[model samples]
Target: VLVPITEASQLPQELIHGTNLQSVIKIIESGAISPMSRNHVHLSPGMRSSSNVYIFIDCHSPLFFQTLKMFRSLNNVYLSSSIPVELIQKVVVKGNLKDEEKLDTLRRILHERNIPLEKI
Candidate 1:
């Protein structure tokens, strides 16, 4: 299901912005970014009708309830649990995360504030 729009010129002009605009454009032109729409663009014939579900939570909110409402509305959709380490950090430590390289900053701040360590 990967729709590779290789031409950067083909993309809408307004969509291209930010400091990494050139890099993004280069990546697009080079066809380095696949499934520019959905991460799961490709699916096997059996997977097409499968009941497997995938969840993407990139925001801080009560998604479980929201997902319940969505699930009720969408009859043919499946639900699955998927959590990344980045999201885990967001949950465990509330803050801003711009660059992955600067993740050590968050770790440093968290470490500075002492938390009671319980015996496992």
Candidate 2:
């Protein structure tokens, strides 16, 4: 069997996507997750990026685990259709907190959602 495991099981508890602070606000405010450039939204079971911010997806959300057509592609990474922000469990902001408008804006929403703001 090339794929195997239909009778295997479901997925894991967490999937994270890495992106900078600038793009995060746009995602939160719009309530829609773009593909970053195009295609499907890039995702992983673990966090990976040089970006200052990371988004943790809730496997509990039906939109992620069942609703959306998201699936792993030819590569190791996951690809998904347009995603809703509600699927996010938390937003971890790496490094410091505020700089100016950008950080302030992103931080504000993080506060709104009570997402864990990372200091590290």
| Local distance difference test values of all predictions, in order | 0.26, 0.67
Which tens-of-lDDT digit does each residue in 38-97 have in candidate 1?
432221111223222211232333343332211111222222222222221111211234
Off by over 4 Å in 2: 1-9, 47-49, 63-66, 97-101, 114-116
What TM-score does structure 1 among the candidates reach?
0.16
Ten contiguous residues with the weakest lDDT in model 2: 1-10
lDDT of 2 at 40: 77
List TM-score per model, in order: 0.16, 0.74
lDDT value, residue 115 of candidate 1: 17
- For every model shown, the clashing-pair count is 0, 0
Top-TM-score candidate index: 2
lDDT of 2 at 2: 18
Candidate 1 regions off by >4 Å? 1-98, 115-120
